[PDB]
Amino acid sequence: QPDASSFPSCLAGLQKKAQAQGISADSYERFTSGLQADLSVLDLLDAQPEFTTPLWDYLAGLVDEQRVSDGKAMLAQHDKLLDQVAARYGVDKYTVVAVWGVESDYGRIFGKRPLLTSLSTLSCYGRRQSFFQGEFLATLKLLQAGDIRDAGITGSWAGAFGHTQFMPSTYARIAVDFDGDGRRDLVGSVPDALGSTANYLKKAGWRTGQPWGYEVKVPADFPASLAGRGKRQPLSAWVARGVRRVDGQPLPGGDEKAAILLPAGAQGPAFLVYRNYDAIYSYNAAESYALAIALLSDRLRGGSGLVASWPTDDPGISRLERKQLQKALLARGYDIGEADGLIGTSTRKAIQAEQKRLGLTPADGRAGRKILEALKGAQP
Ligand SMILES: [Ca+2]
Structure with a gap:
């Protein structure tokens, strides 16, 4: 089993590899001092899920009316910058803002876990140590370069972070300094973030002027x-x-x-x-995210949305509605945690219990319109 006692020798081994790749001992000591193994990150890996989430649930949260309104606000605010991004990389502004919305909610996404804790733990424990060592060392090079300047930066368990939700190796390869200040800052620079999004799609085969x-x-x-x-x-x-x-x-x-x-x-x-859909698909390698980006880009261009219906009696619900559903479950005495709108196992187990109680079928634990309308209380 993994044991915290191996972590110091693992971190000391990685110092020699880091040095060999041009990360100074000063940088390594500064950025890794007081890192501790967080073995809880392994709980999120090779974890068999108990619930299936259909495509229409991903789309209901990723392409909700708030994502669309927020995206139209960003197109208005960043209009001139977005024209410059389109001129420099040959990717249209609707596509660029759609990716920014889906990946990070326009740079507002809570990173649950410190990058250097996740990546050092995954470098030292579990079955993907070689992969994560590459990500860990890429992060230390970005910190040494001053592209990243916050050693406490947060991100996904797998090391996706900032406006673009790039992993560190992607950041190294694809990030651009759009504003020309000598820094590739995909955390604090909207120009660098939007330019890097466009550059990613260009490098993935985007054909200028062609539709997804x-x-x-x-x-x-x-x-x-x-x-x-x-x-x-x-x-x-x-x-x-x-x-x-x-x-x-x-x-x-x-x-x-x-x-x-x-x-x-x-x-x-x-x-x-078309081929531009394949470029989008490469960003997350998941149809849920790829069609979310494509369909959000359609909404941002003034499209009314999907004409066809998904084969369900239980359409997906927005992020706001997920919070309302979670508040409704708490009000009914289900201890599911904070009403943050994230539909995890605790929420889905409470939904399934309510579905069985109410005789709703299937009892699939979905956060859909059927259970929302059944359980909503006063002042949702
Ligand atoms: Ca910059």
């Missing part, structure tokens, strides 16, 4: 077997198969490769995705 894709309508008998991010066909093949834009307009046709996504079955919402 769009929502489409497929015919009743469209074969679900043809769908998937990996299964591209020329647009002419999709036209031949009766695929159309959701407003009935034809596709462009010709020879450009595109995939159809049917994340919720042959008559659920359908998406035609």
Whole structure:
């Protein structure tokens, strides 16, 4: 089993590796002095989840009306900067602000855990030590360079942090100094953050002026077997198969490769995705985040949102509504923690108990509209 007694020898070993890669002993002592193993970070790894979260729950929180209103506020406030970012990297401002909204809520996301604690612990314990050692050493190089200046910086357990939720190795490779002050500051500089977001997408293959894709309508008998991010066909093949834009307009046709996504079955919402969707997808390597960015970018361009409905009687609910649901559960005597809007195991267990009590099916523990409307009390 992991034991805290091994941590000092592990940290001392990493000092020699750090020195070999140009991190000074002074830097290493300054940034790692009083680091302690936090073995609780391993509780979040190779943890089998008890609950399944469908795509429409991710989208209800990532693309909620507050995310859309906040994004339109940022497009207004940062208009001139965003034009300069688009001019310098060839990525449109709606895409850049959509990524900023989904990844960090425009730089407002609470980092639960100190970066250097998570990464040093994961460098010394568990089954991914070599990977996390690279991330740990990349963080120390960024601190030595003064790109990062807060050794107590917080982020995800896996080391994603700042406006962009880059991991340290991504930060090293992709971060830009947009404002030209000699610092690549993705924590405190909105210019550096938006420029780095754009640079990430450019490096991932973004084609200037091309769409991510769009929502489409497929015919009743469209074969679900043809769908998937990996299964591209020329647009002419999709036209031949009766695929159309959701407003009935034809596709462009010709020879450009595109995939159809049917994340919720042959008559659920359908998406035609181009190479720029693949660039977006690379940021989180998860359809939930990739379609959140694409659909938020559609809302920020003044789109009304998804035309098709998800196959549920229980639509997802906003971040504000998740807080209302958590307050409702606390009011009914479920000790689920703070009403922070994060739907974790404690909340989902209380939802499932209420679903079974109320005869709601499925008793899936989802934070959906059905349980919200059932449990809301006074002044939600
Ligand atoms: Ca800068």
